[PDB]
């Protein structure tokens, strides 16, 4: 455990040592370095960001005290403190602009023990999508209901979220609908629950009179239960020649011609999934109800002969395998 904690410290030290000089020059050498982050943001929408070490899964348990102070500073050109731009210990920009995408920030975490850790936060513009399509198949988890997520938000610390279906406000009284954070739960799902769901996320900033509002959309289609069967097709052997390449294709065919309904992979004699590796690699192609995984041998050597390769198709409804043997032609 002490070896591990040491490796973790070393890991972040190496990352500090590989920062650009334009970044590391702002760091306080009495502070631990806690990483960098480049967060998504949208023009004309609010933005917020946490200080990386606080959010980091390797360091969270190190700076987990209720009595921590977090300072935010703009760096880059000059070094300026932030007042208006903080909310609940997080960087806060009520209305993100093109100019913000060029700005970056140094956050500093000071513990009561008088220790400190720092992170750097950038942001980049990312057009928020319009409506995202979602399909719920009846019989998936009907007793729980349908969970609609109020889209990816670029800012936390909202006060209120409101849902509309087909531009009509939904009454949230725990019967048909209930809410949990950014989720709308649709109980007793049925085909008629199909529709356009818009959520409006409300933010409050004292320096602004009315509400800041962010909007997201999901187009929900509820469908009947489907037959998710598929069959796998794979030659039982691949004929090879020492010193030559070879390939073999495994095909998954959806019985009801469902699109993108099968996960397929190749696995080597030792159970590991084959990717774009050396010696043997795999490529996937999918169209309509057909999914193909092709396995490639770059240069067959004698060691390969008699090796067995496994093609796996699964989709949470069914899980099937077929194997093929490398045989000398």
């Amino acid at each position: 455990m002490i070896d591990i904690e040491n490796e973790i410290t070393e890991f972040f030290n190496k990352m500090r040592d590989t920062l650009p000089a334009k970044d590391s020059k702002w760091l306080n050498p009495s502070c631990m370095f806690g990483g960098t982050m480049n967060d998504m943001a949208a023009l004309g929408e609010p933005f917020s960001a946490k200080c990386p070490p606080i959010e980091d899964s390797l360091l969270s348990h190190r700076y987990n005290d209720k009595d921590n102070v977090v300072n935010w500073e703009k760096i880059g050109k000059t070094r300026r403190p932030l007042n208006r731009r903080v909310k609940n210990g997080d960087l806060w920009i009520a209305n993100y602009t093109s100019n913000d995408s060029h700005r970056r920030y140094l956050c500093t975490v000071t513990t009561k023990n008088g220790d400190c850790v720092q992170g750097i936060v950038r942001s980049h513009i990312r057009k928020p999508p319009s409506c995202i399509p979602e399909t719920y198949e009846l019989g998936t988890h009907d007793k729980y209901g349908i969970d609609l997520y109020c889209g990816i938000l670029y800012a936390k610390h909202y006060n209120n979220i409101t849902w509309y279906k087909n531009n009509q406000e939904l009454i949230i009284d725990g019967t048909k609908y209930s809410q949990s954070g950014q989720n709308l739960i649709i109980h007793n799902p049925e085909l008629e629950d199909s529709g356009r769901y818009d959520c409006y996320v409300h933010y409050d900033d004292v320096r602004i009179k009315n509400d800041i509002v962010v909007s997201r959309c999901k187009i929900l289609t509820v469908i009947p239960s489907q037959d998710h069967r598929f069959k796998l097709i794979l030659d039982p052997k691949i004929n090879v020649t020492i010193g030559e390449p070879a390939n073999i294709t495994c095909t998954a065919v959806s019985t009801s011609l469902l699109v993108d309904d099968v996960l397929i992979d190749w696995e080597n004699p030792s159970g590991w999934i084959i990717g774009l590796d050396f010696g043997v690699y795999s490529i996937l192609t999918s169209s309509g109800g057909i999914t193909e995984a092709t396995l490639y041998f770059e240069n067959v050597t004698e060691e390969y002969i008699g090796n067995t390769y496994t093609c796996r198709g699964h989709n949470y409804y069914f899980d099937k395998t077929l194997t093929t043997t490398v045989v000398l032609e």
Partner: protein, 166 residues
Amino acid sequence: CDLPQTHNLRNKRALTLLVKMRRLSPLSCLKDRKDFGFPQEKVGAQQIQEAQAIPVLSELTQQVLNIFTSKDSSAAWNATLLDSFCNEVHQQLNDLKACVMQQVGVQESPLTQEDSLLAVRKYFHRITVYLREKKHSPCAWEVVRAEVWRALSSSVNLLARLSKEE
């Protein structure tokens, strides 16, 4: 973990969007291949239990999300598929983080967790370094997408395996 509802189909949606996202033939990018040292050894069910797996998978899911929400990602991939992919992945991450919350001071085998978390972080760090040295070329992005496909597929197969062993 005590979750209201698990949403396995998100994993199927995400992986098939990722498969669909492919734009080039990897046959055009063979010289750009790279062994990233995927830590199979530290993400296998022959020893790893769900208590250790959760926070490690939360980390992998976060790293995957970090790559595909990056500045360079939206130029590299079809926005429609990309937005849908990130939507599925973000929700799984929400759920995984909630589980990580539930087990704050009651961490089981904190050692193997942290050792695994670090191996995962190093792996993705090598991926991001690779991509930067490659100047985010189309072939480097394919190599990364393929690798991420393989990392996610291994995680999904692991989760499937662990749900069978009970």
